[PDB]
Design a protein around this ligand. Structure first.
Ligand SMILES: [Ca+2]
Ligand SMILES: [Ca+2]
Length: 179
C-alpha cells in the first residue's frame, strides 16, 4: 500500500531505546531492547546502514530475558518483513512476533510467529556492550522473515524470551506492508 514503510533504526542512537518504539523489560532485570551502532561497536555490522536494535541473553553475564519491542500504531498493516541476526556460535535466542489489536500492555499481545534461530551451534566468543574491543566479529548471518498480520493488528511486538545464556538477537529493516 501507499503507507508502506520500513524501520531502519538509522534515526535512533547507540545505547537508547529506538525512536518511535516503546519497550517492556518484563523479566525486570534492567536490560532490554537497545539501538546499537556499528560506529560504536567494532564487532557489529548492521543489515543496512550503521544501526540495528538488539536484545541480549548474555552481555557480560548470563540473562533470562523477557523483553518486548513495540511498534507505533500500524493499523492497516497486513505483513511485517524483517531481518534478524544471532551469534551463530550460540544461536538459540528465541523470539516471538506478536500483535495487539488494542493497547500496549504485555497482555494485549498474542503470538503470531515464533522460532528458535539456528546456527553452527559451535561455540566461540560472545559479544556485548562491555566485551573487550579486540577486533573479533561474530559468525552472524542476516536472515529474512515475512510474517502475516491478522486483521485488526494495531501494534506489532518482537519479544525476546524463553532462552538464557546464548548471546543476542539483532533486528533491522523491519518493513510494514500497509495493505
Ligand atoms: Ca539499519
Ligand atoms: Ca530484561
Amino acid at each position: 500500500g501507499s503507507a508502506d514503510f520500513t524501520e531502519t533504526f538509522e534515526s535512533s542512537t547507540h545505547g537508547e531505546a529506538p525512536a518511535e518504539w516503546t519497550t517492556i523489560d518484563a523479566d525486570g532485570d534492567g536490560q532490554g531492547w537497545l539501538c546499537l551502532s556499528s560506529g560504536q561497536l567494532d564487532w557489529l555490522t548492521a543489515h543496512g546502514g550503521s544501526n540495528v536494535v538488539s536484545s541480549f541473553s548474555w552481555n557480560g553475564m548470563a540473562l533470562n530475558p523477557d523483553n518486548y519491542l513495540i511498534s507505533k500504531d500500524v493499523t492497516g498493516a497486513t505483513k511485517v518483513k524483517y531481518y534478524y541476526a544471532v551469534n551463530d556460535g550460540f544461536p538459540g535466542d528465541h523470539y516471538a512476533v506478536m500483535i495487539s489489536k488494542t493497547g500496549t500492555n504485555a497482555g494485549d499481545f498474542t503470538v503470531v510467529f515464533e522460532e528458535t534461530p539456528n546456527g553452527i551451534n559451535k561455540g566461540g566468543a560472545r559479544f556485548g556492550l562491555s566485551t573487550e574491543a579486540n577486533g573479533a566479529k561474530p559468525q552472524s548471518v542476516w536472515i529474512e522473515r515475512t510474517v502475516d498480520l491478522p486483521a485488526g493488528t494495531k501494534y506489532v511486538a518482537f519479544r525476546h524470551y524463553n532462552c538464557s545464556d546464548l548471546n543476542y538477537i539483532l533486528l533491522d529493516d523491519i518493513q510494514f506492508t500497509m495493505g
